[PDB]
């Protein structure tokens, strides 16, 4: 609506789900989509296909704003890391740079006990 035409895409990748959001330079979100929110459900459907579907849905929702150039941030690992990137690039978007902003701790807090399976 505001026709800013410039924004940044935040991607949060997790072993169980992936989240894609679009915001402006001031951090104000405009639209978002998730793999679980795009018809898929369960970890057995957490493949990069669901991630790209969610990215396409987010792009369709945010197309009303007329964004053309996006700076994309990657948060954490996950199958839907590059799939979301290509999905949003294919939806008429001009990529600028890929920034990895995964929150790596400097051994501050003790990690939860690892699984025994």
């Amino acid at each position: 609506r505001k026709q800013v035409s410039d924004g940044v895409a935040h991607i949060h990748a997790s072993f169980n789900n992936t989240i894609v959001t679009i915001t402006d330079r001031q951090g104000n979100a405009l639209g978002w989509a998730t793999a679980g929110g795009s018809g898929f459900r369960g970890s057995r459907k957490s493949t990069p296909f669901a991630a790209q579907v969610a990215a396409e849905r987010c792009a369709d929702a945010v197309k009303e704003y007329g964004i053309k150039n996006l700076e994309v941030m990657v948060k954490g690992p996950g199958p839907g890391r590059e799939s979301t990137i290509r999905a949003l690039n294919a939806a008429g978007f001009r990529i600028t740079n890929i920034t990895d902003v995964t929150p790596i701790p400097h051994n501050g807090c003790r990690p939860p006990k690892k699984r025994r399976v």
């Binding site: 003790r110 990690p111 006990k113 690892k114």
Partner: peptide, 18 residues
């Protein structure tokens, strides 16, 4: 434990380097 994996990784010190 959060310490056993570190010891296991350090056990491989003598795998093929020395």
């Amino acid at each position: 434990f959060y310490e056993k994996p570190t010891t296991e990784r350090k056990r491989a010190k003598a795998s093929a380097v020395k």
